[PDB]
Design a protein around this ligand. Structure first.
Ligand SMILES: [Mg+2]
Ligand SMILES: [Mg+2]
Ligand SMILES: [Mg+2]
Ligand SMILES: [Mg+2]
Ligand SMILES: [Mg+2]
Ligand SMILES: [Mg+2]
Ligand SMILES: [Mg+2]
Ligand SMILES: [Mg+2]
Ligand SMILES: [Mg+2]
Ligand SMILES: [Mg+2]
Ligand SMILES: [Mg+2]
Ligand SMILES: [Mg+2]
Ligand SMILES: [Mg+2]
Ligand SMILES: [Mg+2]
Ligand SMILES: [Mg+2]
Ligand SMILES: [Mg+2]
Ligand SMILES: [Zn+2]
Lengths: 71, 161, 177, 47, 50, 92
RNA sequence: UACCGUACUGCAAACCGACUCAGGUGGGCUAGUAUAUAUACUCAGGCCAUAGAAUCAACCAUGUUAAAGGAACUCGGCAAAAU
RNA sequence: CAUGGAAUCUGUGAAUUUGAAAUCUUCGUGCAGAUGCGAAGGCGCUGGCAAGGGACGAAGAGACCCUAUGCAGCUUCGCUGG
RNA sequence: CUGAGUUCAGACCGUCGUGAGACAGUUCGGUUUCUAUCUUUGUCAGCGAAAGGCUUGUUUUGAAACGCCUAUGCACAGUUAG
RNA sequence: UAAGUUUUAAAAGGCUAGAUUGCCUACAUUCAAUAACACCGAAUGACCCCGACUUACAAAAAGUUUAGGACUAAAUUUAUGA
């Protein structure tokens, strides 16, 4: 329950292999604003993106709907 | 090459120290050709916590190094982004190096000055809650060719019909 | 220690069950008051299942459904909205009244974050699909739905012309009693 | 602020039945001069 | 019974034990004060102030 | 505040002298009696505050209880207009 | 009709314990069901800041339930259950 | 089965210990129970999560015995003292 | 893991003793610390790159892919080791 | 899950390495943060997941269904008889 000797620099490096992080092999890049994120995640202005210019979504027309606004 | 001198001795000592390390950076490890670099001092993170992120950007090109820093939730990745952005700013606007060919050819973490504290173990024994610091040295070389981007760029969720 | 994910059941969300049901009732009330809320993935998935249950209960429109929703749904300003605007909006939709879009991680604890919103509304982020898809009577699906016992299930207006000949009658008004 | 220390005041009376009585001869009197207006000596001497 | 809290603060007892007047009341207290002076202590007693 | 408008301009030592005069056996411990009277004065100042808080809370309860029913009446009378509008346009 | 106290805290992150310490710290006031200052829910009032986020590890702590038996367990029905 | 640790991630962030280590098994030998010597054999390398047989694990230069020009307190028909 | 008995500190009974005390004589009561460094062991995982020459079997505008032996990878895997 | 239900021969049975043989349009992202659901699964020529409807002759795990998420395409179907 106690180290009997002092760990060497080589043994410490070998033991610390679990602590290292793996590199990610894919990234989703917005061509305008240069943002970077995963392909399954929104990274536009609604999420955190202060560089968003809205050019990330290139078409959004939806004028017609009809309903009862409850007031 | 600075025929002038400062007025106070402190400024003169600092300027001579700066020129000595600019000598040591040239004709040493690398040096030679024109290099954009940055030194981010006193990052409020441990050396192991920074070394967790620094092993990801070692040897990568600049855009996928920014990608590797921007794809993790770690606190150290924001400081690594700050250092890489400072090095990129020096390389592109202070120097005249071409972008999209910069490779992160040298990045390492050195020790900072610690702030010693105290932790209160049981049975009256003292402890520690030392606040660790570290420094970042980033050197961006310019390659002879634009390199392989190492991470495939895919379209986001926004780019959808 | 009971298996909830991997054996289709409700999430535990790090909470006791009475706290868990109360938090879901608060979130479904918030989801229909402001139609898009942002939260962690586990609460987002649990909210999506609970929203389908609550919206169908509002779609029944019965007195027992109102009584059950009166305890489930807190605001009362939005109990009216669930039984009137939401019920008329999704009157013909066979489930799936909510979509989930992941939005990265939050700063305080690096937890995954999802956007959860009601579909088919002005201000949604993806075009909806029609709940019904009128069939071609000259295709294979219609003949399979004639030989087998399936209804027509066509898209309809809120009041079709099949009630027009009853409501036009001046002897079927009763004067309003 | 801890032990009720008495400051450097001059006492003007004494308690007889718990009601303090200020003795009128111990009330403060200031012998100010007749006029300090258009008096020909100022606090400053010219250099 | 947890120990360590023997110091129960009280201004009356502090001044009545280690104050100037109990030090001056006895001869050996006066040599205690005299060797406090000979050492050079800035605070002579626990109740000194100005 | 929290006490009546007649609470100022009224010396409370009339109470002290009154209950010291008509009960001649309160003169045994006069200092204890005065301590009890001063304690009564602070306690009465607290009871005024408590009565004010309870009165304001009981007013606010029925005010919100009325306003909620007014809001539901407005919502139902807004829904009925829409429903009759739909059936009327089905008529036309 | 002077002089001193009057901020803030005071079962506590502000006092005594090296600590933002699960410990120790005196007196007083109080509404309903209701009936005792006990017990369950609640009034006035206060609080949900000092690690967060999901999930089915083993194992540990604390509990609920358990067929047929029932101290056969164990140094000792200790511990639980039971009245 | 329930609650809370433990296990995963993010953030804060100790200590006991430490001659240097790149520390295999068995048998023999040996300051007399060997990771380090001899003979034979085995072993891609490094870890996480677990169990603790070994490292005569760690934690006290006093558990017990003996010794001191050793101390200390106590006892008495030990000795001497007003 | 226990501490039931073999080390104490409290007390009683009996034996011996002038007494402080002794009893391996009977009794009642009397702190079991440790988060695993590496040696084993269970189990779950990561690392251990290649392309070699084709004089390319062919083509002109020894570089480019094509066709070969096996090199990795993957699958079934000795009448095949342990 | 056992207190329940099956099976426990000569050699049977398991684990690790593997001569060979065969094949190759294989950079490894998403469907929920602990795939152990799922690699003997799926990603729109998709019922993989989720929701909706029905079932007391399942006191509820199957059947229909692309409503929602695994994005995606046109000059003969916004698309499988999923
Ligand atoms: Mg558990
Ligand atoms: Mg409860
Ligand atoms: Mg006590
Ligand atoms: Mg002390
Ligand atoms: Mg307390
Ligand atoms: Mg302490
Ligand atoms: Mg405390
Ligand atoms: Mg309560
Ligand atoms: Mg909290
Ligand atoms: Mg029974
Ligand atoms: Mg837990
Ligand atoms: Mg040996
Ligand atoms: Mg292992
Ligand atoms: Mg371990
Ligand atoms: Mg001797
Ligand atoms: Mg869809
Ligand atoms: Zn953008």
């Amino acid at each position: 329950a106690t180290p009997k000797k002092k760990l060497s620099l080589h043994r410490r490096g070998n033991r610390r292999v679990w602590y290292w992080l793996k590199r990610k092999t894919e990234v989703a890049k917005c061509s305008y604003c240069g943002a970077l994120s995963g392909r399954n995640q929104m990274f536009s202005g609604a999420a955190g993106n202060s560089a968003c210019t809205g050019q990330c979504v290139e078409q959004a027309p939806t004028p017609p709907a009809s309903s009862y606004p409850a007031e | 090459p600075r025929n002038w001198m400062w007025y106070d001795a402190d400024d003169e000592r600092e300027e001579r120290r700066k020129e000595r390390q600019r000598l040591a950076w040239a004709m040493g490890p690398g040096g030679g050709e024109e290099v954009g670099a940055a030194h981010l001092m006193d990052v409020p993170q441990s050396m192991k916590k920074m070394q967790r992120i620094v092993k990801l950007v070692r040897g990568l090109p600049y855009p996928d190094a920014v990608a590797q820093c921007s794809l993790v939730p770690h606190k150290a990745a924001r400081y690594m982004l700050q250092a890489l952005e400072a090095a990129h700013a020096d390389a592109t606007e202070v120097k005249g190096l071409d972008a999209e060919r910069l490779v992160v050819g040298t990045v390492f973490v050195t020790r900072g000055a610690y702030e010693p504290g105290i932790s209160y173990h049981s049975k009256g024994r003292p402890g520690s809650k030392t606040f660790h610091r570290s420094h970042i040295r980033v050197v961006l070389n310019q390659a002879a060719e634009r390199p392989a981007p190492f991470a495939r760029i895919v379209a986001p969720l926004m780019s959808r019909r | 220690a009971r298996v909830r994910v991997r054996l289709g059941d409700w999430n535990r969300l790090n909470r006791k069950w009475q706290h868990r049901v109360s938090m879901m009732k608060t979130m479904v009330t918030q989801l229909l008051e402001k139609e898009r809320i942002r939260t962690t993935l586990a609460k987002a998935k649990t909210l999506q299942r609970y929203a389908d249950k609550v919206i169908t209960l509002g779609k029944q429109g019965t007195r027992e459904a109102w009584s059950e929703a009166r305890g489930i749904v807190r605001t009362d300003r939005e109990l009216h909205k669930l039984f009137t605007q939401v019920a008329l909006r999704y009157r013909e939709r066979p489930g799936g009244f909510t979509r989930l879009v992941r939005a990265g991680w939050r700063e305080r604890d690096a937890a995954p974050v999802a956007f959860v919103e009601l579909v088919d509304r002005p201000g949604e982020l993806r075009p909806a699909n029609p709940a019904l898809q009128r069939p071609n009577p000259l295709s294979v699906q219609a003949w399979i739905r004639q030989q087998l016992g399936q209804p027509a299930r066509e898209p309809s207006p809120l009041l079709p012309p099949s009630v027009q000949q009853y409501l036009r009658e001046e002897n079927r008004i009763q004067q309003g009693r | 602020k801890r032990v009720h220390v008495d400051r450097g005041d001059v006492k003007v009376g004494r308690l007889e039945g718990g009601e303090f009585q200020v003795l009128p001869h111990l009330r403060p009197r200031y012998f100010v001069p007749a006029d300090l207006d258009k008096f020909q000596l100022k606090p400053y001497v010219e250099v | 019974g947890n120990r360590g809290n023997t110091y129960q603060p009280s201004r009356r007892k502090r001044v009545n034990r280690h104050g100037l007047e109990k030090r001056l009341s006895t001869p050996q207290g006066r040599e205690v004060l005299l060797r406090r002076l000979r050492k050079g202590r800035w605070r002579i007693t626990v109740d000194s102030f100005r | 505040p929290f006490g009546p408008p007649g609470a100022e301009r009224s010396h409370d030592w009339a109470t002290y002298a009154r209950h010291l005069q008509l009960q001649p056996e309160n003169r045994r411990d006069l200092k204890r009696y005065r301590a009890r009277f001063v304690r009564f004065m602070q306690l009465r100042e607290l009871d005024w505050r408590e009565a004010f808080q309870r009165g304001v809370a009981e007013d606010s309860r029925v005010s919100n209880k009325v306003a909620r029913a007014k809001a539901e009446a407005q919502r139902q009378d807004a829904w009925s207009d829409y429903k009759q509008a739909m059936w009327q346009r089905a008529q036309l």
